[PDB]
Amino acid sequence: AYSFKVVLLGEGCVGKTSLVLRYCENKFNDKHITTLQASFLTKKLNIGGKRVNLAIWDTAGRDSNGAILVYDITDEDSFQKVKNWVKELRKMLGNEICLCIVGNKIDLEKERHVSIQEAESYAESVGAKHYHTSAKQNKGIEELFLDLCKRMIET
């Protein structure tokens, strides 16, 4: 009965499709197969006795209730690029949209080049919540989507 549209955004190597494929199929690919077109899948959840249909839109590289802005923790450049989307989404929809700033590939912690403090403090500064995930190890994905849904219900 709750119906939310959520979009995944981020640079070309951050793992947008990998997050969705793991969450929805329990699968993961080492090959980067670049997304040529936006596509959706619907996740059904019950939260607080309420049914939720979550339309998750993956993107090729105004409607949305939430946006998942994915970066690669080993790639500083991928993190800074998130900030453009934040600026654009905030200009468009203000604080209405639930923003997630997601550091993916936490399995590659050994090669981290984005500071967690900067990531989290930046997230807070734009009214966003920060999240850590790995599509490869299936960590933090269940909770990302769940938390985003809870947050989208609060309005």
The nearer residue to ligand GNP, 2 or 28, going by C-beta atoms, is 28
Q: Contact, 59 vs 38, CB < 8 A?
A: yes
Dihedral-angle region of residue 3 (phi above 0 means left; psi in -120 to 50 means alpha; beta otherwise): beta
Binding residue (CB under 6 A) for ligand GNP from 26, 34, 125, 155? 34
> Considering the rule CB under 6 A, would residue 155 count as an interface residue with ligand GNP?
no
| 150 φ, ψ (degrees, to nearest 5) | -55, -50
31 vs 4: CA distance, rounded Å: 30
Judged by the rule CB under 6 A, the positions of this chain that interact with ligand GNP are: 10, 12-18, 29-30, 32-35, 61, 104-105, 107-108, 134-136
Q: Binding site: what residues are annotated? A: 12, 15-18, 29-30, 32, 34-35, 58, 61, 104-105, 107, 135-136
